[PDB]
PDB file of all heavy atoms in Angstrom:
ATOM      1  N   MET D   1      30.007 -29.984  23.023  1.00  2.00           N
ATOM      2  CA  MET D   1      29.469 -29.796  24.378  1.00  2.00           C
ATOM      3  C   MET D   1      28.055 -30.324  24.538  1.00  2.00           C
ATOM      4  O   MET D   1      27.634 -31.191  23.773  1.00  2.00           O
ATOM      5  CB  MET D   1      29.548 -28.323  24.766  1.00  2.00           C
ATOM      6  CG  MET D   1      28.968 -27.390  23.722  1.00  2.00           C
ATOM      7  SD  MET D   1      30.022 -25.961  23.326  1.00  2.00           S
ATOM      8  CE  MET D   1      30.555 -26.391  21.654  1.00  2.00           C
ATOM      9  N   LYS D   2      27.301 -29.816  25.513  1.00  2.00           N
ATOM     10  CA  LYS D   2      25.917 -30.220  25.693  1.00  2.00           C
ATOM     11  C   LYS D   2      25.070 -29.692  24.564  1.00  2.00           C
ATOM     12  O   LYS D   2      25.291 -28.550  24.092  1.00  2.00           O
ATOM     13  CB  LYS D   2      25.415 -29.775  27.043  1.00  2.00           C
ATOM     14  CG  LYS D   2      25.970 -30.563  28.244  1.00  2.00           C
ATOM     15  CD  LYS D   2      25.515 -30.007  29.582  1.00  2.00           C
ATOM     16  CE  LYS D   2      26.115 -30.778  30.726  1.00  2.00           C
ATOM     17  NZ  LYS D   2      25.804 -30.148  32.043  1.00  2.00           N
ATOM     18  N   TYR D   3      24.063 -30.459  24.153  1.00  2.00           N
ATOM     19  CA  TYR D   3      23.230 -30.116  23.033  1.00  2.00           C
ATOM     20  C   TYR D   3      21.901 -30.837  23.170  1.00  2.00           C
ATOM     21  O   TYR D   3      21.787 -31.852  23.859  1.00  2.00           O
ATOM     22  CB  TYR D   3      23.888 -30.513  21.690  1.00  2.00           C
ATOM     23  CG  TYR D   3      23.743 -31.998  21.399  1.00  2.00           C
ATOM     24  CD1 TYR D   3      22.737 -32.440  20.514  1.00  2.00           C
ATOM     25  CD2 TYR D   3      24.590 -32.941  21.933  1.00  2.00           C
ATOM     26  CE1 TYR D   3      22.614 -33.800  20.217  1.00  2.00           C
ATOM     27  CE2 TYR D   3      24.458 -34.287  21.661  1.00  2.00           C
ATOM     28  CZ  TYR D   3      23.474 -34.688  20.807  1.00  2.00           C
ATOM     29  OH  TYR D   3      23.330 -36.052  20.530  1.00  2.00           O
ATOM     30  N   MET D   4      20.919 -30.299  22.465  1.00  2.00           N
ATOM     31  CA  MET D   4      19.615 -30.982  22.338  1.00  2.00           C
ATOM     32  C   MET D   4      19.049 -30.641  20.954  1.00  2.00           C
ATOM     33  O   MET D   4      19.545 -29.763  20.249  1.00  2.00           O
ATOM     34  CB  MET D   4      18.656 -30.565  23.448  1.00  2.00           C
ATOM     35  CG  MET D   4      18.140 -29.135  23.316  1.00  2.00           C
ATOM     36  SD  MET D   4      16.675 -29.031  22.282  1.00  2.00           S
ATOM     37  CE  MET D   4      15.608 -30.203  23.099  1.00  2.00           C
ATOM     38  N   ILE D   5      18.038 -31.407  20.550  1.00  2.00           N
ATOM     39  CA  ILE D   5      17.445 -31.246  19.223  1.00  2.00           C
ATOM     40  C   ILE D   5      15.929 -31.382  19.364  1.00  2.00           C
ATOM     41  O   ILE D   5      15.411 -32.394  19.890  1.00  2.00           O
ATOM     42  CB  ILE D   5      17.974 -32.327  18.231  1.00  2.00           C
ATOM     43  CG1 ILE D   5      19.483 -32.403  18.203  1.00  2.00           C
ATOM     44  CG2 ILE D   5      17.418 -32.041  16.817  1.00  2.00           C
ATOM     45  CD1 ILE D   5      20.058 -33.469  17.317  1.00  2.00           C
ATOM     46  N   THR D   6      15.197 -30.377  18.885  1.00  2.00           N
ATOM     47  CA  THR D   6      13.732 -30.461  18.851  1.00  2.00           C
ATOM     48  C   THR D   6      13.304 -30.852  17.418  1.00  2.00           C
ATOM     49  O   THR D   6      14.015 -30.628  16.426  1.00  2.00           O
ATOM     50  CB  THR D   6      13.088 -29.106  19.206  1.00  2.00           C
ATOM     51  OG1 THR D   6      13.677 -28.053  18.387  1.00  2.00           O
ATOM     52  CG2 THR D   6      13.337 -28.748  20.668  1.00  2.00           C
ATOM     53  N   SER D   7      12.120 -31.444  17.373  1.00  2.00           N
ATOM     54  CA  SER D   7      11.594 -31.932  16.095  1.00  2.00           C
ATOM     55  C   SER D   7      10.157 -31.435  15.870  1.00  2.00           C
ATOM     56  O   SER D   7       9.418 -31.327  16.856  1.00  2.00           O
ATOM     57  CB  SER D   7      11.618 -33.480  16.068  1.00  2.00           C
ATOM     58  OG  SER D   7      11.060 -33.989  14.883  1.00  2.00           O
ATOM     59  N   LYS D   8       9.835 -31.138  14.640  1.00  2.00           N
ATOM     60  CA  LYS D   8       8.447 -30.849  14.288  1.00  2.00           C
ATOM     61  C   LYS D   8       7.510 -31.970  14.635  1.00  2.00           C
ATOM     62  O   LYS D   8       6.303 -31.732  14.854  1.00  2.00           O
ATOM     63  CB  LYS D   8       8.354 -30.482  12.790  1.00  2.00           C
ATOM     64  CG  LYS D   8       6.952 -30.387  12.228  1.00  2.00           C
ATOM     65  CD  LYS D   8       6.741 -29.150  11.387  1.00  2.00           C
ATOM     66  CE  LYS D   8       5.353 -29.158  10.725  1.00  2.00           C
ATOM     67  NZ  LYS D   8       4.259 -29.349  11.705  1.00  2.00           N
ATOM     68  N   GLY D   9       8.023 -33.207  14.727  1.00  2.00           N
ATOM     69  CA  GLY D   9       7.167 -34.331  15.143  1.00  2.00           C
ATOM     70  C   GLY D   9       6.617 -35.137  14.045  1.00  2.00           C
ATOM     71  O   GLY D   9       5.810 -36.033  14.305  1.00  2.00           O
ATOM     72  N   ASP D  10       6.940 -34.830  12.804  1.00  2.00           N
ATOM     73  CA  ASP D  10       6.534 -35.691  11.691  1.00  2.00           C
ATOM     74  C   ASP D  10       7.560 -36.768  11.441  1.00  2.00           C
ATOM     75  O   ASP D  10       8.583 -36.846  12.138  1.00  2.00           O
ATOM     76  CB  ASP D  10       6.322 -34.839  10.394  1.00  2.00           C
ATOM     77  CG  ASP D  10       7.597 -34.221   9.888  1.00  2.00           C
ATOM     78  OD1 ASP D  10       8.637 -34.283  10.579  1.00  2.00           O
ATOM     79  OD2 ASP D  10       7.563 -33.666   8.758  1.00  2.00           O
ATOM     80  N   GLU D  11       7.287 -37.676  10.503  1.00  2.00           N
ATOM     81  CA  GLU D  11       8.202 -38.794  10.267  1.00  2.00           C
ATOM     82  C   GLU D  11       9.560 -38.291   9.791  1.00  2.00           C
ATOM     83  O   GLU D  11      10.617 -38.790  10.235  1.00  2.00           O
ATOM     84  CB  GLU D  11       7.608 -39.752   9.267  1.00  2.00           C
ATOM     85  CG  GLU D  11       6.812 -40.893   9.888  1.00  2.00           C
ATOM     86  CD  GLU D  11       6.471 -41.979   8.857  1.00  2.00           C
ATOM     87  OE1 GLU D  11       6.940 -41.873   7.733  1.00  2.00           O
ATOM     88  OE2 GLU D  11       5.751 -42.928   9.211  1.00  2.00           O
ATOM     89  N   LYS D  12       9.558 -37.310   8.911  1.00  2.00           N
ATOM     90  CA  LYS D  12      10.827 -36.807   8.360  1.00  2.00           C
ATOM     91  C   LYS D  12      11.748 -36.258   9.422  1.00  2.00           C
ATOM     92  O   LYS D  12      12.925 -36.627   9.524  1.00  2.00           O
ATOM     93  CB  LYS D  12      10.558 -35.775   7.275  1.00  2.00           C
ATOM     94  CG  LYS D  12      11.781 -35.393   6.468  1.00  2.00           C
ATOM     95  CD  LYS D  12      11.404 -34.563   5.256  1.00  2.00           C
ATOM     96  CE  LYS D  12      12.242 -34.976   4.042  1.00  2.00           C
ATOM     97  NZ  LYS D  12      13.694 -35.028   4.370  1.00  2.00           N
ATOM     98  N   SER D  13      11.217 -35.357  10.261  1.00  2.00           N
ATOM     99  CA  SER D  13      12.066 -34.676  11.222  1.00  2.00           C
ATOM    100  C   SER D  13      12.495 -35.597  12.355  1.00  2.00           C
ATOM    101  O   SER D  13      13.684 -35.574  12.739  1.00  2.00           O
ATOM    102  CB  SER D  13      11.336 -33.474  11.777  1.00  2.00           C
ATOM    103  OG  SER D  13      10.841 -32.674  10.723  1.00  2.00           O
ATOM    104  N   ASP D  14      11.588 -36.420  12.876  1.00  2.00           N
ATOM    105  CA  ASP D  14      11.969 -37.370  13.920  1.00  2.00           C
ATOM    106  C   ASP D  14      13.097 -38.259  13.511  1.00  2.00           C
ATOM    107  O   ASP D  14      14.051 -38.493  14.283  1.00  2.00           O
ATOM    108  CB  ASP D  14      10.738 -38.209  14.322  1.00  2.00           C
ATOM    109  CG  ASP D  14       9.800 -37.521  15.233  1.00  2.00           C
ATOM    110  OD1 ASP D  14      10.165 -36.417  15.701  1.00  2.00           O
ATOM    111  OD2 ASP D  14       8.680 -38.036  15.480  1.00  2.00           O
ATOM    112  N   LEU D  15      13.077 -38.753  12.263  1.00  2.00           N
ATOM    113  CA  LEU D  15      14.115 -39.679  11.791  1.00  2.00           C
ATOM    114  C   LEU D  15      15.423 -38.948  11.602  1.00  2.00           C
ATOM    115  O   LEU D  15      16.476 -39.507  11.916  1.00  2.00           O
ATOM    116  CB  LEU D  15      13.663 -40.341  10.487  1.00  2.00           C
ATOM    117  CG  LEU D  15      12.834 -41.622  10.552  1.00  2.00           C
ATOM    118  CD1 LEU D  15      13.732 -42.818  10.577  1.00  2.00           C
ATOM    119  CD2 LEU D  15      11.895 -41.633  11.788  1.00  2.00           C
ATOM    120  N   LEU D  16      15.385 -37.720  11.090  1.00  2.00           N
ATOM    121  CA  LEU D  16      16.629 -36.953  10.984  1.00  2.00           C
ATOM    122  C   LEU D  16      17.235 -36.708  12.326  1.00  2.00           C
ATOM    123  O   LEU D  16      18.438 -36.799  12.487  1.00  2.00           O
ATOM    124  CB  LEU D  16      16.350 -35.647  10.251  1.00  2.00           C
ATOM    125  CG  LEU D  16      17.586 -34.816   9.895  1.00  2.00           C
ATOM    126  CD1 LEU D  16      18.520 -35.664   9.033  1.00  2.00           C
ATOM    127  CD2 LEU D  16      17.223 -33.517   9.168  1.00  2.00           C
ATOM    128  N   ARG D  17      16.392 -36.412  13.307  1.00  2.00           N
ATOM    129  CA  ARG D  17      16.888 -36.168  14.656  1.00  2.00           C
ATOM    130  C   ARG D  17      17.584 -37.415  15.226  1.00  2.00           C
ATOM    131  O   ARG D  17      18.708 -37.308  15.792  1.00  2.00           O
ATOM    132  CB  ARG D  17      15.746 -35.722  15.576  1.00  2.00           C
ATOM    133  CG  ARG D  17      16.128 -35.518  17.040  1.00  2.00           C
ATOM    134  CD  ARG D  17      14.909 -35.131  17.873  1.00  2.00           C
ATOM    135  NE  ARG D  17      15.219 -35.104  19.283  1.00  2.00           N
ATOM    136  CZ  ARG D  17      15.131 -36.120  20.096  1.00  2.00           C
ATOM    137  NH1 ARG D  17      14.797 -37.322  19.656  1.00  2.00           N
ATOM    138  NH2 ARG D  17      15.480 -35.931  21.378  1.00  2.00           N
ATOM    139  N   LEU D  18      16.956 -38.564  15.107  1.00  2.00           N
ATOM    140  CA  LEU D  18      17.572 -39.820  15.607  1.00  2.00           C
ATOM    141  C   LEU D  18      18.894 -40.101  14.904  1.00  2.00           C
ATOM    142  O   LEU D  18      19.850 -40.569  15.534  1.00  2.00           O
ATOM    143  CB  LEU D  18      16.617 -40.981  15.471  1.00  2.00           C
ATOM    144  CG  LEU D  18      15.737 -41.386  16.671  1.00  2.00           C
ATOM    145  CD1 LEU D  18      14.848 -40.218  17.079  1.00  2.00           C
ATOM    146  CD2 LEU D  18      14.911 -42.605  16.381  1.00  2.00           C
ATOM    147  N   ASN D  19      18.975 -39.795  13.608  1.00  2.00           N
ATOM    148  CA  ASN D  19      20.234 -40.002  12.869  1.00  2.00           C
ATOM    149  C   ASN D  19      21.300 -39.028  13.302  1.00  2.00           C
ATOM    150  O   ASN D  19      22.492 -39.353  13.281  1.00  2.00           O
ATOM    151  CB  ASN D  19      19.968 -39.936  11.377  1.00  2.00           C
ATOM    152  CG  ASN D  19      19.521 -41.215  10.774  1.00  2.00           C
ATOM    153  OD1 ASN D  19      19.745 -42.303  11.388  1.00  2.00           O
ATOM    154  ND2 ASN D  19      18.866 -41.210   9.667  1.00  2.00           N
ATOM    155  N   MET D  20      20.913 -37.776  13.636  1.00  2.00           N
ATOM    156  CA  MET D  20      21.943 -36.824  14.102  1.00  2.00           C
ATOM    157  C   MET D  20      22.397 -37.165  15.518  1.00  2.00           C
ATOM    158  O   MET D  20      23.593 -37.050  15.826  1.00  2.00           O
ATOM    159  CB  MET D  20      21.378 -35.401  14.039  1.00  2.00           C
ATOM    160  CG  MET D  20      21.129 -34.899  12.637  1.00  2.00           C
ATOM    161  SD  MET D  20      20.571 -33.185  12.610  1.00  2.00           S
ATOM    162  CE  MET D  20      22.033 -32.325  13.197  1.00  2.00           C
ATOM    163  N   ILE D  21      21.489 -37.568  16.392  1.00  2.00           N
ATOM    164  CA  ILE D  21      21.861 -38.051  17.708  1.00  2.00           C
ATOM    165  C   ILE D  21      22.886 -39.161  17.592  1.00  2.00           C
ATOM    166  O   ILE D  21      23.892 -39.221  18.328  1.00  2.00           O
ATOM    167  CB  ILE D  21      20.647 -38.506  18.506  1.00  2.00           C
ATOM    168  CG1 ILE D  21      19.687 -37.327  18.718  1.00  2.00           C
ATOM    169  CG2 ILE D  21      21.058 -39.063  19.850  1.00  2.00           C
ATOM    170  CD1 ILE D  21      18.321 -37.753  19.195  1.00  2.00           C
ATOM    171  N   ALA D  22      22.676 -40.109  16.651  1.00  2.00           N
ATOM    172  CA  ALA D  22      23.623 -41.188  16.441  1.00  2.00           C
ATOM    173  C   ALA D  22      24.975 -40.663  15.961  1.00  2.00           C
ATOM    174  O   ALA D  22      26.036 -41.142  16.409  1.00  2.00           O
ATOM    175  CB  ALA D  22      23.068 -42.192  15.423  1.00  2.00           C
ATOM    176  N   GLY D  23      24.978 -39.632  15.094  1.00  2.00           N
ATOM    177  CA  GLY D  23      26.217 -39.017  14.693  1.00  2.00           C
ATOM    178  C   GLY D  23      26.906 -38.344  15.844  1.00  2.00           C
ATOM    179  O   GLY D  23      28.160 -38.412  15.934  1.00  2.00           O
ATOM    180  N   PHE D  24      26.185 -37.644  16.697  1.00  2.00           N
ATOM    181  CA  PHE D  24      26.780 -37.001  17.854  1.00  2.00           C
ATOM    182  C   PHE D  24      27.327 -37.990  18.850  1.00  2.00           C
ATOM    183  O   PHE D  24      28.277 -37.674  19.597  1.00  2.00           O
ATOM    184  CB  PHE D  24      25.793 -36.063  18.514  1.00  2.00           C
ATOM    185  CG  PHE D  24      25.544 -34.781  17.756  1.00  2.00           C
ATOM    186  CD1 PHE D  24      24.290 -34.447  17.308  1.00  2.00           C
ATOM    187  CD2 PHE D  24      26.579 -33.878  17.509  1.00  2.00           C
ATOM    188  CE1 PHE D  24      24.016 -33.284  16.609  1.00  2.00           C
ATOM    189  CE2 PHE D  24      26.372 -32.725  16.799  1.00  2.00           C
ATOM    190  CZ  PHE D  24      25.082 -32.417  16.380  1.00  2.00           C
ATOM    191  N   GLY D  25      26.752 -39.189  18.931  1.00  2.00           N
ATOM    192  CA  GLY D  25      27.295 -40.223  19.790  1.00  2.00           C
ATOM    193  C   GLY D  25      28.731 -40.597  19.498  1.00  2.00           C
ATOM    194  O   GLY D  25      29.423 -41.088  20.362  1.00  2.00           O
ATOM    195  N   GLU D  26      29.153 -40.353  18.269  1.00  2.00           N
ATOM    196  CA  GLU D  26      30.510 -40.669  17.833  1.00  2.00           C
ATOM    197  C   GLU D  26      31.538 -39.615  18.236  1.00  2.00           C
ATOM    198  O   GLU D  26      32.747 -39.838  17.983  1.00  2.00           O
ATOM    199  CB  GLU D  26      30.557 -40.830  16.287  1.00  2.00           C
ATOM    200  CG  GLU D  26      29.627 -41.880  15.804  1.00  2.00           C
ATOM    201  CD  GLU D  26      29.896 -43.266  16.416  1.00  2.00           C
ATOM    202  OE1 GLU D  26      31.075 -43.599  16.576  1.00  2.00           O
ATOM    203  OE2 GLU D  26      28.958 -44.012  16.704  1.00  2.00           O
ATOM    204  N   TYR D  27      31.127 -38.518  18.855  1.00  2.00           N
ATOM    205  CA  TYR D  27      31.999 -37.433  19.315  1.00  2.00           C
ATOM    206  C   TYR D  27      31.808 -37.198  20.806  1.00  2.00           C
ATOM    207  O   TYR D  27      30.973 -37.848  21.445  1.00  2.00           O
ATOM    208  CB  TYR D  27      31.721 -36.147  18.519  1.00  2.00           C
ATOM    209  CG  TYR D  27      31.919 -36.226  17.049  1.00  2.00           C
ATOM    210  CD1 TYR D  27      30.892 -36.608  16.220  1.00  2.00           C
ATOM    211  CD2 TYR D  27      33.153 -35.900  16.452  1.00  2.00           C
ATOM    212  CE1 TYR D  27      31.024 -36.696  14.839  1.00  2.00           C
ATOM    213  CE2 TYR D  27      33.299 -35.961  15.067  1.00  2.00           C
ATOM    214  CZ  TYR D  27      32.258 -36.332  14.299  1.00  2.00           C
ATOM    215  OH  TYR D  27      32.417 -36.422  12.917  1.00  2.00           O
ATOM    216  N   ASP D  28      32.579 -36.278  21.341  1.00  2.00           N
ATOM    217  CA  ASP D  28      32.450 -35.872  22.755  1.00  2.00           C
ATOM    218  C   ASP D  28      31.265 -34.882  22.889  1.00  2.00           C
ATOM    219  O   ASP D  28      31.424 -33.738  23.300  1.00  2.00           O
ATOM    220  CB  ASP D  28      33.756 -35.241  23.217  1.00  2.00           C
ATOM    221  CG  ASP D  28      33.795 -35.080  24.728  1.00  2.00           C
ATOM    222  OD1 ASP D  28      33.025 -35.792  25.445  1.00  2.00           O
ATOM    223  OD2 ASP D  28      34.641 -34.238  25.218  1.00  2.00           O
ATOM    224  N   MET D  29      30.077 -35.409  22.551  1.00  2.00           N
ATOM    225  CA  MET D  29      28.858 -34.639  22.649  1.00  2.00           C
ATOM    226  C   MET D  29      27.908 -35.370  23.584  1.00  2.00           C
ATOM    227  O   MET D  29      27.625 -36.579  23.424  1.00  2.00           O
ATOM    228  CB  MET D  29      28.208 -34.460  21.266  1.00  2.00           C
ATOM    229  CG  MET D  29      29.086 -33.809  20.244  1.00  2.00           C
ATOM    230  SD  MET D  29      29.398 -32.036  20.606  1.00  2.00           S
ATOM    231  CE  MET D  29      28.188 -31.256  19.624  1.00  2.00           C
ATOM    232  N   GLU D  30      27.385 -34.649  24.591  1.00  2.00           N
ATOM    233  CA  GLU D  30      26.419 -35.214  25.558  1.00  2.00           C
ATOM    234  C   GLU D  30      25.064 -34.525  25.327  1.00  2.00           C
ATOM    235  O   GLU D  30      24.966 -33.306  25.231  1.00  2.00           O
ATOM    236  CB  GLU D  30      26.901 -34.957  26.981  1.00  2.00           C
ATOM    237  CG  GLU D  30      25.801 -34.940  28.025  1.00  2.00           C
ATOM    238  CD  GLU D  30      26.273 -34.551  29.385  1.00  2.00           C
ATOM    239  OE1 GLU D  30      27.312 -33.918  29.486  1.00  2.00           O
ATOM    240  OE2 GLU D  30      25.540 -34.937  30.366  1.00  2.00           O
ATOM    241  N   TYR D  31      24.032 -35.354  25.174  1.00  2.00           N
ATOM    242  CA  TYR D  31      22.680 -34.886  24.970  1.00  2.00           C
ATOM    243  C   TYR D  31      22.142 -34.357  26.313  1.00  2.00           C
ATOM    244  O   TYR D  31      22.041 -35.170  27.270  1.00  2.00           O
ATOM    245  CB  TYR D  31      21.766 -35.936  24.369  1.00  2.00           C
ATOM    246  CG  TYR D  31      20.391 -35.430  24.027  1.00  2.00           C
ATOM    247  CD1 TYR D  31      20.077 -35.005  22.752  1.00  2.00           C
ATOM    248  CD2 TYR D  31      19.384 -35.368  24.989  1.00  2.00           C
ATOM    249  CE1 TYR D  31      18.829 -34.561  22.412  1.00  2.00           C
ATOM    250  CE2 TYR D  31      18.122 -34.920  24.656  1.00  2.00           C
ATOM    251  CZ  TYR D  31      17.826 -34.484  23.351  1.00  2.00           C
ATOM    252  OH  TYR D  31      16.587 -34.027  23.044  1.00  2.00           O
ATOM    253  N   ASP D  32      21.768 -33.110  26.403  1.00  2.00           N
ATOM    254  CA  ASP D  32      21.227 -32.507  27.597  1.00  2.00           C
ATOM    255  C   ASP D  32      20.240 -31.439  27.162  1.00  2.00           C
ATOM    256  O   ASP D  32      20.625 -30.413  26.589  1.00  2.00           O
ATOM    257  CB  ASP D  32      22.308 -31.904  28.492  1.00  2.00           C
ATOM    258  CG  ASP D  32      21.790 -31.594  29.879  1.00  2.00           C
ATOM    259  OD1 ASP D  32      20.577 -31.672  30.111  1.00  2.00           O
ATOM    260  OD2 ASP D  32      22.644 -31.293  30.760  1.00  2.00           O
ATOM    261  N   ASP D  33      18.939 -31.682  27.380  1.00  2.00           N
ATOM    262  CA  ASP D  33      17.939 -30.657  27.039  1.00  2.00           C
ATOM    263  C   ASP D  33      17.617 -29.781  28.265  1.00  2.00           C
ATOM    264  O   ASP D  33      16.667 -28.980  28.191  1.00  2.00           O
ATOM    265  CB  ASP D  33      16.662 -31.304  26.489  1.00  2.00           C
ATOM    266  CG  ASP D  33      15.929 -32.178  27.506  1.00  2.00           C
ATOM    267  OD1 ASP D  33      16.398 -32.297  28.651  1.00  2.00           O
ATOM    268  OD2 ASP D  33      14.866 -32.702  27.149  1.00  2.00           O
ATOM    269  N   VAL D  34      18.356 -29.904  29.337  1.00  2.00           N
ATOM    270  CA  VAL D  34      18.205 -29.037  30.506  1.00  2.00           C
ATOM    271  C   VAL D  34      19.102 -27.818  30.392  1.00  2.00           C
ATOM    272  O   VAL D  34      18.586 -26.684  30.371  1.00  2.00           O
ATOM    273  CB  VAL D  34      18.509 -29.804  31.809  1.00  2.00           C
ATOM    274  CG1 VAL D  34      18.218 -28.905  33.014  1.00  2.00           C
ATOM    275  CG2 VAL D  34      17.694 -31.062  31.902  1.00  2.00           C
ATOM    276  N   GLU D  35      20.399 -27.996  30.224  1.00  2.00           N
ATOM    277  CA  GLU D  35      21.365 -26.942  30.042  1.00  2.00           C
ATOM    278  C   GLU D  35      22.191 -27.191  28.753  1.00  2.00           C
ATOM    279  O   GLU D  35      23.405 -27.320  28.862  1.00  2.00           O
ATOM    280  CB  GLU D  35      22.253 -26.793  31.234  1.00  2.00           C
ATOM    281  CG  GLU D  35      21.560 -26.264  32.491  1.00  2.00           C
ATOM    282  CD  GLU D  35      22.502 -26.202  33.676  1.00  2.00           C
ATOM    283  OE1 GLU D  35      23.468 -27.017  33.724  1.00  2.00           O
ATOM    284  OE2 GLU D  35      22.284 -25.386  34.602  1.00  2.00           O
TER     285      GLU D  35
END
Side-chain angles (χ1 to χ4, degrees):
Chain D
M1 50 227 109
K2 287 176 182 173
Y3 80 99
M4 71 86 56
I5 309 175
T6 53
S7 177
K8 167 133 175 55
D10 65 351
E11 269 192 5
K12 190 169 221 310
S13 309
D14 280 351
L15 272 271
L16 188 57
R17 177 183 173 272
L18 265 61
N19 275 338
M20 292 184 66
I21 298 166
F24 285 120
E26 302 301 322
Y27 301 88
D28 194 20
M29 302 292 264
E30 158 185 21
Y31 186 95
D32 193 351
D33 67 359
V34 183
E35 291 176 334

